DNA sequence: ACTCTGCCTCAAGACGGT
DNA sequence: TAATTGAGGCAGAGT
DNA sequence: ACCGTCC
């Protein structure tokens, strides 16, 4: 993500944040960062500090949420396409190594609480070690196929390919919490689109054109702003936060110019700073071709979903059948069958 | 006064009967 | 064979 | 809407 960008928008560019009722999105298509939704379910969907699972010990929390949340979206006429990450870019390797440190230390502190018969400490580092695996992604892809819900494999970061689907008009918005989707150029970003019966947070749209207008920037200047704020791909400047970062971009436009005019003794830049390379990655990321695959929402295969979710993963047959019926009727009401001419 | 850093914590789902 | 993110809150120090 | 339960 971008450190503090959502807060900056809310304070400087509030006009870019628009809220609408779930009832207004009937018929709209959205792109979803699948990995983040899977992670949300593995973290939250716990029963007694442990995850849901079948008797074979195979985890099912990700299948639980993917199934029901996706159905709820379709009942509201919202048609999602799930986008899965691919090979991370090299620039992320500098940050990937720093993540393993946190997992290594979280593992060290895990067995410590275990050998110490702790209770709340076990549930503390356990959730901190959660991670989305290839088997998590493959099982969700398998589920979506049976549900008739489309998905796409991005060549690199899913966030970037979601944005490219919006640019191309193949979906209305990227439904995510990772604000760096705007840094990748997404015209629209939607938060809090869960279609949950609770309705605790309002559906927010972030319109990039509004952000650029109220900040007085173009896209390249907005990317440099996000770099100074803090991105996954390179270092920021120590002592330059969201307040000074805005004033500098608005005044000097480019980081290259900010360095020329900054006092090297007062605000020294990082050593071997890759702000140019991250700039190139945000503006011209490796993305799928939106014109290659035509997004279709298809009839779900009920009998295979029962065999998979119930026979194998041990979901309630009554609940799964009911879910597939809802999914099939809601698709019939929001989706036109294919026509030939 | 304003701003930034480095700490700290906390939460992160959904169904169906009541 | 995976590497969130986000939001606040607080004290303390730099501008 | 609350809350035990989901697997
Ligand atoms: K910084
Ligand atoms: Sm990201
Ligand atoms: Sm099995
Ligand atoms: Sm990602
Ligand atoms: Sm990241
Ligand atoms: Sm089995």
Numbering used by the authors: 2 to 342
Task: Quote from the publication.
The structure-specific nuclease, flap endonuclease-1 (FEN1) plays a vital role in maintaining genome integrity by precisely processing intermediates of Okazaki fragment maturation, long-patch excision repair, telomere maintenance, and stalled replication forks. FEN1 preferentially binds to double flap substrates with a one nt 3′-flap and any length of 5′-flap, including zero.
In the hFEN1-D86N and hFEN1-R100A structures, the ssDNA (5′-flap) region of the substrate threaded through the tunnel formed by the gateway/cap. In both threaded substrate structures, the ss 5′-flap phosphodiester backbone is ‘inverted’ between the +1 and +2 positions, with the +2 and +3 phosphates facing away from the active site metals and the DNA bases facing the metals. The overall inverted flap orientation resembles the hFEN1-R100A structure with the +1 phosphate remaining within 7 Å of Arg104, but shifted towards Arg103, presumably due to Arg100 removal. The −1 and −2 nts display less base overlap (stacking), and the +1 and −1 nts are no longer hydrogen bonded to the template strand (4–6 Å apart). Notably, as duplex DNA is not shifted close to the catalytic metal in the R100A structure, this structure may represent a pre-reactive substrate form.
